[PDB]
Amino acid sequence: RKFFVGGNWKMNGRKQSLGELIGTLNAAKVPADTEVVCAPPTAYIDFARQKLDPKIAVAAQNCYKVTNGAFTGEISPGMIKDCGATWVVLGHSERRHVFGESDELIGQKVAHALAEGLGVIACIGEKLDEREAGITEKVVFEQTKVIADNMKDWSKVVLAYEPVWAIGTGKTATPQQAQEVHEKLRGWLKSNVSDAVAQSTRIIYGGSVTGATCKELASQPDVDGFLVGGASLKPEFVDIINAKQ
Amino acid sequence: SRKFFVGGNWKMNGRKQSLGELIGTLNAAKVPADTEVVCAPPTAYIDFARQKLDPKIAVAAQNCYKVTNGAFTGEISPGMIKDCGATWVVLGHSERRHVFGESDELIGQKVAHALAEGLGVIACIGEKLDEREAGITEKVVFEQTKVIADNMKDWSKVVLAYEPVWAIGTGKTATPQQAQEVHEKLRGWLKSNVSDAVAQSTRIIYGGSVTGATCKELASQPDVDGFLVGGASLKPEFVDIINAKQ
């Protein structure tokens, strides 16, 4: 499994500030063993791909489940590809819990993005009430299941565990808590899909990661990389890229 | 003195090559000074479209969120839309409301923020078939317009688009006279609840089925001030609709 560092810019930046960030990213030495992906705001997918060096891949932050249609405000994997992006983030916690995207919709997006030739960063994770009621496994397994049932080929998927229970709650995850969930996820893939899928699928950590914390997280045997939030908008992202070095 | 307004909502259609062809057609087209023309591309192509379209055509975003930056993966802000050279945003479109579950409250907040950020707003309202058949057209469109109104300090940068959602994909058709009835009622609501100044100056555009053949009759209705066009906005037929008053 190649180490995978994704940067989720979320709804941040303008051409000036993003252009600057991109200059900083273009100066990064990307390790030969590490795959790097940046997810700009949708209005800047095209802009970012044009300005970023090809050593960094571009992802969309979301997409819909058909190629063209009467879906005001949506983009398709076809448009994503057309702008030179090769990845899409699907099932992000904000899509699920702010915007109410169901597991079934997320699964249908995943199959369509994969069929169009995109890589997919598929996100799962439990909230605090779910964790504290003891149902972390039930939640993340069902989210992973609904994805799994809506797809066939696992080679272009990266799984991203998001400890949603650590977002603005006053709790945070230790590296050991992250490892524990990643290990259970890998175990789910083994028992529900195949050994081969379990062994080759990157499971990346989508919780808080900084330049200070990235190496300890990366050393966890079942943590294969990151989907970075806030630090992805800073030079600090370049150091996170180096987490396995 | 209400300037005729024609919006083209490209929805989730096209790629750089095919939209480039469309833009070529629009650039070559005669736009009467009469008319304010606005095109809304897929969000991935707002920048692309603004760079290639002649300045006689304004660019809209198809949706936005309600804060300037934030942890809202998949969203764009009015600041981003303006940064890409677009001067309008479409809000409350029937697909946002009914396919993607956007509440009146959220739409009102978006309108407020977009207006505060300097964008124009194409604010969409309309009733479904079940609401129409229950006799509650007025109640529905008045409540939607009210929520939008509660989130307004200035009306000069707003265009209201009535979408007869009951008549889009249902088998049912709407007549020019049915469109006019809703439009005059909305304007009456503006007069009673906002001001006569707003009622007299606010473009109320029709967002139902419009083609080259029907646009002229619709445009002649006294309270129909233009169009928010769907499918036909992707075709040269759009130029016929731009010229519906000519």
Q: Give the active site residues of B.
A: 93, 163
Chain B residues with a Cβ under 8 Å from any Cβ in chain A: 9, 11-16, 40, 42-48, 61-63, 65, 67, 69-77, 79-81, 83-84, 90, 93, 95-96, 99-101, 230-231
Rounded distance between C-alpha atoms, residue A207 and residue A175, angstroms: 10
Both structure tokens of B73:
């993966």
Q: How far apart are CA A97 and CA A90, in angstroms?
A: 13
Locate B37 and state its tokens. 């023309």
Which residues are paired to A49 by β-bridges?
none
Q: Is the dihedral of CA B47, B52, B56, B57 positive or negative?
A: negative
Interface of A with B (CB under 8 A): 8, 10-15, 39, 41-47, 60-62, 64, 66, 68-76, 78-80, 82-83, 89, 92-95, 98-100, 229
Contact predicate A136/A185, CB 8 Å: no
What gap in Å lies between CA A152 and CA A170, rounded to an integer?
A: 38
Residue in B209, B142, B211, B132 with CA at minimum distance from that of residue B175: B209
End-to-end CA distance of chain A, in Å?
A: 15
CB burial of B51-72 (b: ≥16 within 10 Å; e: otherwise) equals ebbeeebbbbbbbbbbbebebb
Extract the tokens encoding B168.
């889009």
CA angle in degrees (0–180, nearest 5) for A118-A61-A111 = 40
CB-based contact A120:A88 (threshold 8 Å): yes
3-state secondary structure chain B: CCCEEEEEECCECCCHHHHHHHHHHHHHCCCCCCEEEEEECCHHHHHHHHHHCCCCEEEEECCCCCCCCECCCCCCCHHHHHHCCCCEEEECCHHHHHCCCCCHHHHHHHHHHHHHCCCEEEEEECCCHHHHHCCCHHHHHHHHHHHHHHCCCCCCCEEEEECCHHHCCCCCCCCHHHHHHHHHHHHHHHHHHCCHHHHHHCCEEECCCCCCCCHHHHHCCCCCCEEEECHHHHCCHHHHHHCCCC
Residues whose CB falls within 8 Å of the CB of residue B70, separated by 6 or more in sequence, listed in order: A10, A11, A12, B77
Quick check: helix, strand or coil at residue A102?
coil
What the block records as the tokens of A76 is 């398709």
Largest Cα separation within chain B, whole Å, is 48
Dihedral angle at the C-alpha atoms of A9, A15, A21, A24, nearest 10 degrees? Answer: 140
Residue the block writes with tokens 């050994």: A195
- Pair of tokens at residue B56: 């006689």
Residue B55 CA from chain centroid, whole number: 19
Q: Which residue from A11, A15, A93 is facing B76, i.e. has the nearest CB?
A: A11
Is A156 part of any known ligand binding site?
no
DSSP alpha helix (H) spans, A3-150: 15-26, 45-51, 77-82, 93-97, 103-115, 128-132, 136-149
Burial class (CB in 10 A: 0-12, 13-18, 19+), B30: exposed
Residues in A touching B45 (Cβ below 8 Å)? 46, 79
Interaxial angle between packed helices B104-116 and B137-150, expressed in degrees from 0 to 180 and rounded to the nearest 10? 40
Contact B83 A14 (CB under 8 A): yes
Is A99's CB within 8 Å of B70's CB? Answer: no
Regarding beta strands B4-9 and A225-228, do their DSSP bridges make them parallel or antiparallel, or are they unpaired? unpaired
User: What tokens were used for B92?
Assistant: 């409350």
Beta-carbon contacts of residue B59 (< 8 Å; ≥ 6 apart): B38, B39, B40, B41, B46, B49, B50, B53, B84, B85, B86, B87, B88
Locate the chain B residue with the closest alpha carbon to A59: B74
Distance CA B173, CA B75 (A): 34
Residue B157 corresponds to which tokens in the numbers above?
Answer: 């940068």
Query: What's the rounded Cα separation, in Å, for the pair A218 and A234?
Result: 19
Determine the residue type at A228: V
Asked if A79's CB is within 8 angstroms of B42's CB, the reply is yes
- Experiment type: X-ray
* Beta-ladder partners of B5: B36, B226
A12 interaction partners in chain B (CB closer than 8 Å): 69-70
Name the minimum distance, in Å, from the CA of B191 to any CA of chain A.
Answer: 30
Q: Which helix (H) or strand (E) holds A180?
A: helix A175-192
Which residues in chain B have Cβ-Cβ distances shorter than 8 Å to A72?
Answer: 9, 11-12, 40, 62-63, 90, 93, 95-96
CB contact at 8 A, B120 and B88: yes
**In whole angstroms, what is the distance from residue B234 CA to residue B18 CA?**
9
Q: Which residues pair with A119 in a beta bridge?
A: A87
A37 contacts on B by Cβ (under 8 Å) = none
